């Protein structure tokens with residue numbers, strides 16, 4: 001982790017002690033491993049909840065739920081056991097503690113097991129399982145001229161009575177919380193995203209919520225796909241966003257406007273973006289996923305390990321920042337190549353913290369980190385986002401003023417800034433690589449075999465921030481052709497393969513001064529007319545499997561065709577700009593490209609016409 005940042009080993013493996021209560025007797029007991037961090041703020045007191053695995057890190061062993069709390073931002077802590085297991089056997093355990101804060105109360109939901117030695121999803125029945133809720137009340141005193149906190153943990157109550165034997169077809173077996181930190185919805189509901197099994201041993205996610213302060217609970221009727229576990233959720237613009245774990249696959253993300261009655265995959269923003277390993281073929285993880293306000297902008301924070309080592313090692317814990325449009329990698333929170341899987345991020349009084357695991361030889365500690373550097377970076381990126389959105393929106397468009405340039409769904413913008421080999425994203429998330437490029441105001445001039453710029457889509461590798469483009473996009477640019485080509489040459493497009501030979505949608509230009517719009521695999525029909533040196537406005541749109549190509553605000557003749565067979569979903573390799581950037585491709589595009597914009601939707605007619613009219617006003621050169 002970053003410059004200026006620091007940590008301590010707070011929950012220390014084989015060292016920290018907790019008050020182990022059995023049969024009315026308490027003994028300070030050393031704990032082998034601590035896992036499943038949840039870090040929250042209750043009325044100014046920081047509270048950290050986790051598993052205390054007494055003798056071993058094996059999942060199916062002796063576990064109580066431990067809590068530490070601090071009134072001085074983590075400088076000093078008191079320690080308690082928030083929830084004890086049944087003591088029925090040497091493997092009795094309360095597990096996957098999931099926390100909600102409302103007023104001065106901490107709602108903690110745990111699974112409770114008595115004697116099984118096997119993993120929960122493997123169970124053929126529910127005989128060893130219960131689902132419990134404990135409430136902790138947090139009070140503060142200023143006696144003695146100091147702040148003293150205390151937390152009184154009530155007895156756990158079983159919520160089993162609220163679990164229906166049947167759901168939309170299936171028969172239910174067990175459920176648990178998704179671990180970490182859940183929420184109170186804007187309407188006051190307590191909301192836990194939960195992981196549920198059926199008699200087929202399939203796992204799936206749902207919304208489990210209470211409209212009466214936790215006295216009664218209900219299930220939404222919809223669900224995730226099968227295979228989605230450990231769900232984590234936040235509320236964004238009136239809707240729940242449910243971020244799920246999928247072992248051996250990319251993470252799936254869903255939105256619901258009705259407490260889980262209906263679930264829609266968020267294909268246009270966050271779903272399938274985050275991979276659980278470099279090859280997305282290893283176990284997933286628990287993730288922190290919260291909505292916060294920083295310097296007045298509403299955003300989301302998300303953590304997940306990169307897992308270069310594989311299996312459940314889960315090294316290299318990374319933190320991400322997004323506004324539901326752009327997706328920025330803040331960086332690695334953990335240190336070196338240490339194993340570091342589960343985590344919890346907290347933003348309190350304009351300070352950022354992380355409670356996370358470190359794992360050596362299957363012995364786990366939780367470190368408590370002060371993310372000083374990470375918050376500095378975050379605030380710089382958010383400033384950049386605000387500044388450019390402000391710039392675009394402040395432009396008085398050719399009428400007094402016409403309609404504003406749209407920033408809604410604007411994800412990336414290539415304009416004046418660039419280096420010898422990169423065209424820089426003004427929004428700072430994804431740069432394009434270049435070859436044979438010369439800098440010019442608000443863009444690049446390209447020439448020669450192998451020339452052009454490449455804006456990676458699936459090529460981003462593990463984490464694919466532009467996976468929305470396989471469902472809808474609008475890509476815009478101003479282009480100027482300097483030489484008549486020998487035969488069709490490319491200007492702009494979306495490629496389905498690494499070379500650019502198989503295109504989803506694109507535009508090329510030919511020796512007869514015609515345009516060559518390319519609609520999927522359809523045979524190309526040249527059309528319209530172009531002139532050398534003239535600056536043209538180009539827009540490619542794709543939505544609902546149909547692509548269109550506009551020139552100067554006007555649809556090329558024949559635009560509006562099918563570019564995706566309704567069976568399949570595309571896997572776009574990259575966008576190419578100003579050529580293919582492939583030496584293996586024989587084309588030589590001699591062109592200047594300025595002001596490339598990528599939106600995560602199909603722009604409408606008015607929007608398209610406004611961008612056309614304000615071409616010469618949107619560049620970044622004059623304002624840095």
Ligand SMILES: CC(=O)N[C@H]1[C@H]([C@H](O)[C@H](O)CO)OC(C(=O)O)=C[C@@H]1O
Pocket residue numbers: 059095096119120121178179195229230284285286312341
């Ligand atoms: C009850 C239980 O076994 N929980 C385990 C959990 C589980 O797999 C998931 O919460 C449900 O599918 O996974 C992990 C894990 O480090 O990957 C830690 C927990 O020990």
